[PDB]
Amino acid sequence: YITDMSIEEISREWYMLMPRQKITGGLMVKMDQAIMDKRITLKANFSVLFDQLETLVSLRAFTDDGAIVAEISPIPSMPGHSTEDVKNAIGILIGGLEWNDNSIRASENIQRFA
Amino acid sequence: YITDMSIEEISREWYMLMPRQKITGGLMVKMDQAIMDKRITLKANFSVLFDQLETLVSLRAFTDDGAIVAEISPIPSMPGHSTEDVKNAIGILIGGLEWNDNSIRASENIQRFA
DSSP states (O other): OBOOSOTTTTSOOOOOSSOOEEEETTEEEEEOTTOOSOEEEEEEEEEESSSSEEEEEEEEEEOTTOOEEEEEEEOSSOOOOOSHHHHHHHHHHHHHHGGGTOEEEEOHHHHHOO | OEESSOHHHHHSOOOOSSEEEEEETTEEEEEETTOOSOEEEEEEEEEEETTEEEEEEEEEEEETTSOEEEEEEEOSSSOOOOHHHHHHHHHHHHHHHGGGTOEEEEOHHHHHHO
């Protein structure tokens, strides 16, 4: 099991100026269209089996000022999913952010297991 | 050499309310951020060689409305783009559009050669 976020930072209620979402694999992917020209920093809490991602808890995206603008949590009702599902939820999100000229950096673990 | 687009279509000028344009290779994807939940159809005029694509002249995207909301055109300063470039511009455009809950359909010719 791995962690990039304070139990606080993962339990922090957050909201969007311009809500967007996309449901993939077993993964909900939300992200605020309002954000542009910022650095976004990706932090995932997740589990691992045999040196590889096993299950995602939450990935959240922070700005320089530590605000969260996008999350990638499992589906509430129907969460079962693989890790190949995750790499895509991320491509998806990252893709959306970079459309608004934001530049993206990812947690170290996030790059090891994805 | 293939043409989904009547000359009027590929020549006509067109506008956006929430413009956004990414770059990839020698190609310039612009899209109107202001469009939500519309069906978009991709028509592309392009040159083919053998049984695969050669040079995009342009790819525009239309609502059932006939209005063009996106365009993947070759950058004038450097004009050269690649086959793979085009594959990327398109994926990028789908993705950027599909965030606004838009549904896409591609011309036969596009699906055939890309």
